[PDB]
Amino acid sequence: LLFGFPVYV
Amino acid sequence: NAGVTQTPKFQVLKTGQSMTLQCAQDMNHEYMSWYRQDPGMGLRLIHYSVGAGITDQGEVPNGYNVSRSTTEDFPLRLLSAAPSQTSVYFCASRPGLAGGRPEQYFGPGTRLTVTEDLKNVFPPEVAVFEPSEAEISHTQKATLVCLATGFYPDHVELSWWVNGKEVHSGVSTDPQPLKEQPALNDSRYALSSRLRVSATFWQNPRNHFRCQVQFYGLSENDEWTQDRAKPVTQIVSAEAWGRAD
Amino acid sequence: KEVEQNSGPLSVPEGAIASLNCTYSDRGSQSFFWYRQYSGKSPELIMSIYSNGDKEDGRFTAQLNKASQYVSLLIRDSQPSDSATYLCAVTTDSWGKLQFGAGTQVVVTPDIQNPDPAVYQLRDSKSSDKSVCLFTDFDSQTNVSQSKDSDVYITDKTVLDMRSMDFKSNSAVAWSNKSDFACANAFNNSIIPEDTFFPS
Amino acid sequence: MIQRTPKIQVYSRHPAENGKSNFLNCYVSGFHPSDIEVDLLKNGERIEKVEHSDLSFSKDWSFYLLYYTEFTPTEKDEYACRVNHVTLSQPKIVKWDRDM
Amino acid sequence: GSHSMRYFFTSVSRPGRGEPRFIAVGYVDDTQFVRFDSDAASQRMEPRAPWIEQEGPEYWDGETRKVKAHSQTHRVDLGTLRGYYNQSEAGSHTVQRMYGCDVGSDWRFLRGYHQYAYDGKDYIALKEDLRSWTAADMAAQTTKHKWEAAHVAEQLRAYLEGTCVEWLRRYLENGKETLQRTDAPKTHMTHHAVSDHEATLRCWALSFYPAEITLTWQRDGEDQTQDTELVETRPAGDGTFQKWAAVVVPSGQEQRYTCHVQHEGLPKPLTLRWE
What we know:
The complex is a heteropentamer.
Chain B lengths: L4 E3 L2 E5 L4 E6 L6 E8 L3 E10 L2 E4 L6 E3 L9 E3 L8 E8 L10 E2 L3 E6 L9 E6 L2 H7 L1 E11 L4 E7 L2 E3 L10 E2 L9 E10 H4 L5 E8 L18 E8 L4
Parallel strand pairs in B: 2-11
Antiparallel strand pairs in B: 1-3, 3-8, 4-5, 4-9, 5-6, 7-8, 9-10, 9-11, 12-13, 13-17, 14-15, 14-18, 16-17, 18-19
Chain C lengths: L2 E3 L4 E4 L4 E7 L6 E7 L6 E6 L3 E5 L2 E6 L4 E6 L8 E8 L7 E2 L3 E6 L8 E7 L6 E6 L15 E3 L3 E5 L4 E10 L6 H4 L14
Chain E lengths: L2 E12 L3 E11 L2 E7 L8 E2 L9 H28 L9 E10 L5 E10 L2 E6 L6 E3 L2 H12 L2 H23 L1 H4 L6 E8 L5 E10 L4 E7 L2 E3 L4 E2 L3 E2 L5 E9 L7 E7 L6 E4 L2
Antiparallel strand pairs in E: 1-2, 1-5, 2-3, 3-4, 5-6, 6-7, 7-8, 9-10, 10-15, 11-12, 11-16, 13-15, 14-15, 16-17
């Protein structure tokens, strides 16, 4: 199951 | 930061009028939502928007329209208001992909009432009732009650004011205005408050007590046919003085 | 129904533990939220939890069991200003909508050392055509109902905090408009205590 | 960009016995960037029905990809894998060595 | 033994040609289980292993939405980084990201990791404690301070120590035939002459799972990496793996050169001499 919270660089 | 601001706090409309509800957010959030909340149903999603320029519907989108032209602003508009839109509208915001600490923060709300004809709109009558002589005898304490009655819509704010300054430190106002006749949606409303002070505070006649009720209704711009007075957004007060007994 | 919450209303006295429950139904849920909402205003975020175990923050304690799909909230040492409805919220990701429970309403009743139940009649300062019965100083166990004929309006039980004596007190208010009605008759629809003071 | 020449390995899934069905594998790995042309050849002509793995990468960030086709090996049929990439001055043919 | 769950994400920009190519792949150990290709038909996360189709519609719905969210961050990441290094609009550039977790043979948490690369060298990495970041250069320093400010590592650690190990475990018991098997390598040895006074000995290992294997050569005791040729471990494509090792022998002495095979599915480590 994938990570819920990706944030930009 | 200001967080989420919403405008305005209260509103009345008749059937058919248009209205936009403002919303703003301070935090460079991408994800903004509009909700409504209702006594039987809880929070329901109307529309929502996961970036600037782009928007999509939720579970209750019928009759509401939305646009997100900037990151900060997400106005909800209603083009033909209907009495099923009598509700509490909340804005909410959430970071999206921009700064992922995942919590959603809501706005202060817009309480909104739509009625079939706006001759239903009434300001409150306000009265203060003085502490019973028996109470003072029995307890050495003095309860002033305030009655605000006869108003529609239920858009009221009650404060108590002694000697010119506002008091919180002996107050209990009702959380909800009571229906005077639970048989109509046209039915007017009533609200009580209580101010308890010591006997020796109340027996000083220098002390001025005052029950203020801020009411929200029509505006100065509005058309009015009745020779009863035009029920604008106004403050209605009642007062009492100390009694030397 | 995605988020299932504690039914309500939940009444505890001051100093007690208010325990709140919440189960959800999406297994892949990864973020968990408690909200406070006082009547009349907006939902305010009080607790966020992210992984299994206990988070403590002042008087609040949220716990999470992802494996049995359960979030909780303890309110230790209750103020009467903790009286609100408490919303459970659950999400899966940045882009998945926040799922909300219906809310559990929590009432914090005040510690009243020695009551004296009493019904008083108030007269006004000016010129209004009602008159008011105040029911005051009564037990926190005591209820007030509201039926009768519909010319008689009774409010609900509310609590004031005088910060002089550290005195808290309960009260409800009844009035009729055009009537003939008396105070020792107006609260007959409620279970008033037997030793309630009726003034002459 | 930063460039890496691919490793080509041409081989079969099972030990190849003439007349029995098998799978011919071309395994390109260790390359960067991901842009790559990979064809499988039967006597120098292009096989169409070729499947690839999904693109993935190793501990040094280099890509790897497995291209594969179903076949039946004979005594004379020559198989080869043809790879084009920015690191290669002309495209590369690697012939299937059968005891390898 | 130890297990792992890893996700791999590649984004590559296509100036003048369009929105970047996005490919995502999930593995448990060495079994790919899901994929998303931005260029595929369905525009959804698709199954790749039998045992993951017993997940309901909710699962796929959710995973599609999250992989599209990942896609979107990478899309934007390519443009940010182009600005960070003042590169031209005309060039094609590469972002790769990989994250996941390891568990031990009790299945309890062991390691968590989250790595990032721009054009095939490291950009930013979550350190072993899962609290702090290693940045590669001055441009990654911007990203490091932004991710400190936006509490990224907090969310990462919650996943890596929590959800990542909770779902791996689910997957492992869902695919017990598939994942909990270990296949021993089927060994083999060949010999071909190179010169007249020279020979090549080639150790072989076929049909093994998982891919972790050691093949080493040695004359008479002291081991050898001087004539030694290893190829990379290559998939057979049925789910099992293959690898070989060769050395050049001063011929006549193929009596006293021996081959060591180390693999997890082997009870004893294999000693192989040319008979």
